[PDB]
Scaffold this active site. Structure first.
Site, short mmCIF file in Angstrom:
data_model
loop_
_atom_site.label_atom_id
_atom_site.label_comp_id
_atom_site.label_asym_id
_atom_site.label_seq_id
_atom_site.Cartn_x
_atom_site.Cartn_y
_atom_site.Cartn_z
N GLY A 121 0.83 -1.19 0.00
CA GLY A 121 0.00 0.00 0.00
C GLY A 121 0.88 1.25 0.00
O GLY A 121 2.03 1.22 -0.44
N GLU A 166 -0.81 2.54 -6.58
CA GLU A 166 0.05 1.73 -5.76
C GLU A 166 0.12 0.26 -6.22
O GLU A 166 1.17 -0.40 -6.07
CB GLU A 166 -0.39 1.79 -4.27
CG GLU A 166 -0.27 3.19 -3.59
CD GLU A 166 1.18 3.73 -3.43
OE1 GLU A 166 2.17 2.99 -3.62
OE2 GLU A 166 1.33 4.95 -3.15
N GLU A 218 3.59 -1.50 -7.41
CA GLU A 218 3.99 -2.72 -6.73
C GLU A 218 4.13 -3.92 -7.65
O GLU A 218 5.15 -4.59 -7.64
CB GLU A 218 2.99 -3.02 -5.61
CG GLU A 218 3.29 -4.26 -4.77
CD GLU A 218 4.63 -4.13 -4.02
OE1 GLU A 218 4.91 -3.07 -3.40
OE2 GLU A 218 5.43 -5.08 -4.08
N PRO A 263 -5.83 4.78 17.35
CA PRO A 263 -4.88 5.89 17.38
C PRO A 263 -3.35 5.52 17.37
O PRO A 263 -2.55 6.23 16.74
CB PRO A 263 -5.29 6.67 18.67
CG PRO A 263 -6.65 6.24 18.98
CD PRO A 263 -6.87 4.88 18.40
N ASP A 264 -2.99 4.43 18.02
CA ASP A 264 -1.63 3.92 18.00
C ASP A 264 -1.35 2.73 17.02
O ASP A 264 -0.38 2.01 17.22
CB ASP A 264 -1.21 3.53 19.48
CG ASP A 264 -2.15 2.41 20.12
OD1 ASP A 264 -3.32 2.17 19.63
OD2 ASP A 264 -1.68 1.76 21.13
N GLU A 312 11.85 -8.28 0.35
CA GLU A 312 11.28 -9.60 0.51
C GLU A 312 9.79 -9.56 0.18
O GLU A 312 8.96 -9.13 1.01
CB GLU A 312 11.54 -10.12 1.92
CG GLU A 312 11.24 -11.66 2.07
CD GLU A 312 12.32 -12.52 1.44
OE1 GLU A 312 12.01 -13.64 1.04
OE2 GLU A 312 13.49 -12.10 1.38
#
Lengths: 256, 259
Positions: free
Chosen positions: A69, A85, A89, A108-109, A138
C-alpha cells in the site's frame, strides 16, 4: 475582535463563504493517510489462491509481513491511490471495477511512529504476476487456504495463521500493524458476498469455466472443490455469468 | 555512534530494539508532507410503526462551509480517538443521541479531493439503526430533525416541514428544492443502497423495529426499502426465506428477534 473565538464565531456564522475560507486557511491535528491492499490472484496451473505480502526490514514490526500500500496524494481519492500503488507494486493495470473498499483502520496507535489512518481495499488482480528478484525487498505471493475457522498464508517455510473470528495471529511468522485484522476482514467480506455478488471470480482473469469458479468458492469455503455439487452450483450462480463461448468447455465472464 | 545520518537511521530501524527505535524516532526532525483533515459522518435510520415511516436524522448547519444547509451530523476526529469513538462522541454532542459501538457499522470512506471547500478532508461514514429518540441540538446545529425518508422508484425523498431533498439512487443526483451539504447526498444514497444490498441475507436493518417483530412488520420495513407495497411480498415465501436469521418467542401471530 476581543480574542480567539470570538473571531471564530464571526467567520463561521456571519461572514461570507470566501471570507470564512480565507480566515480558515490562514489558521485540529492531522493523520498521515494511506491505503493498504489485499491483492488476490489465482494461479490456474497450481490451482492456488494467493495474496501478496512484503516483509519489513525495518522497525517498527521488523521482520513482520505487511500488505502492500502507500500514501494517498492530495490530488487523489483513495480509489485512485489503490490503482497507482498496485501498478507500482505489481506492474498490473487494474480499474475500480477490480477493487472494493473494505474498511478504514484508525486505532490511534496502530502505527507507533505517529498518527496514521489507513483505508483498506480488496483488489482482484487476475493471474499471478511475476516478481523479478531483488534482495532489497522480501516480497512473495503467499498461498492462501482455509481450514475451519482459520486461514493460512504460506510461502516456503513462512506460515501465517489467522483466526477468522478474532483476527488473532497464531504463529511465529507475524503480520505488521493491524494487517491481520485487514486480511480477515477481506477474507470474510468475500465469504459473505460471493454467493450473490461473485466479483471475486475476477481472480480467474478474462474468462472462466463453472468448475474453475467452483474451485475459487472452495478455497474461500475451506472445502474440497469435489464436495461442491457441480450442478447445484451452476444453477445458483449462472444468473451472474454471461456466456462467452468455448472436448471444448463452456466459458463465462461476470456480468456487470 | 555514527558516522553518517544513513548509518544512524538503519542502526535504529534494523539493529536496535523496538524500545530504542521508538525512543530515537520521536526525537527526530521528521520531513513534512501534506495531510488531510479526518472527519466522521453518521447516517441514523429509524422507523415509525404507526406511520409506516422510515426516517433519517439531519441537522441544519449553523456555520460555514454550507451554513444553513441540511447535512448529516459529523465532525473532526481527534488524534487520540478512533473513528468509531469519534462518530459516537460527535453524534451525542450534535444530536443528543447515545448509541453503543456494537450498534454502528462503518459504511464507506469518502475521499474525493474536492468534497469539502476547506481543502483536503476525508470522511469515514457510519450507519446505525435505532429508535426514534428525542433529539437535542448541539451548538453547531441550528436544527436537528428526523426527516421522513420515502422511496419512489429509483429516488428517495427526505422531508421535514417545507424542506424537500430528492436523490437519485443510481447517480446521487439531487432533484429536490433543497440540496444536502458537502457530498452528503452520496453518503445517504450509499447508506440506503447498502441496506437494500444486505437485508436479504443479513437483516440487521430489522433493528429499527426494536428487539421484537412479526413477519408483517419485517415485510413493511423491507417494502419501505424496496419501494413496494408490503402486500406484494408474499408472507409465506418471506417467512421461509428469512427465518434462519430469527429467534424470538410468541405470540395470533409470532414475535421474532434477530439472533
Amino acid at each position: 475582535f476581543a480574542s480567539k473565538a470570538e473571531e471564530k464565531n464571526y467567520y463561521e456564522r456571519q461572514a461570507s463563504l470566501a471570507e470564512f475560507l480565507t480566515w480558515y486557511h490562514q489558521q485540529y491535528e492531522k493523520p498521515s493517510l494511506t491505503v493498504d491492499m489485499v491483492l488476490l490472484c489465482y494461479n490456474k496451473e497450481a490451482d492456488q489462491l494467493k495474496v501478496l505480502l512484503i516483509q519489513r526490514k525495518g522497525h517498527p514490526f521488523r521482520n513482520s509481513w505487511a500488505l502492500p500500500g502507500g500514501f494517498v496524494n492530495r490530488n487523489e481519492s483513495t480509489e485512485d491511490s489503490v490503482l497507482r500503488e498496485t501498478k507500482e507494486e505489481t506492474g498490473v493495470v487494474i480499474s475500480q471495477e477490480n477493487i472494493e473498499q473494505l474498511h478504514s483502520f484508525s486505532r490511534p496507535d496502530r502505527d507507533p511512529r505517529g498518527w496514521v489512518v489507513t483505508v483498506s481495499y480488496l483488489a482482484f488482480i487476475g493471474e499471478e504476476p511475476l516478481i523479478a528478484g531483488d534482495d532489497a525487498k522480501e516480497v512473495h505471493w503467499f498461498n492462501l487456504e482455509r481450514h475451519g475457522q482459520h486461514i493460512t498464508l504460506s510461502h516456503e517455510d513462512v506460515e501465517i495463521t489467522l483466526d477468522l473470528k478474532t483476527a488473532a495471529s497464531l504463529g511465529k511468522d507475524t503480520l505488521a500493524f493491524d494487517h491481520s485484522e485487514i486480511i480477515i476482514k477481506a477474507f470474510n467480506r468475500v465469504v459473505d458476498k460471493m454467493e450473490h455478488e461473485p466479483q471475486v471470480l475476477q481472480v480467474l482473469g478474462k474468462d472462466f469455466t463453472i468448475t474453475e469458479a467452483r474451485k475459487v468458492f472452495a478455497k474461500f469455503l475451506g472445502v474440497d472443490y469435489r464436495s461442491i455439487d457441480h450442478s447445484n452450483f451452476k444453477k445458483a450462480m449462472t444468473q451472474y455469468f454471461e456466456e462467452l463461448g468455448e472436448r471444448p468447455s463452456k466459458i463465462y465472464q461476470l456480468k456487470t
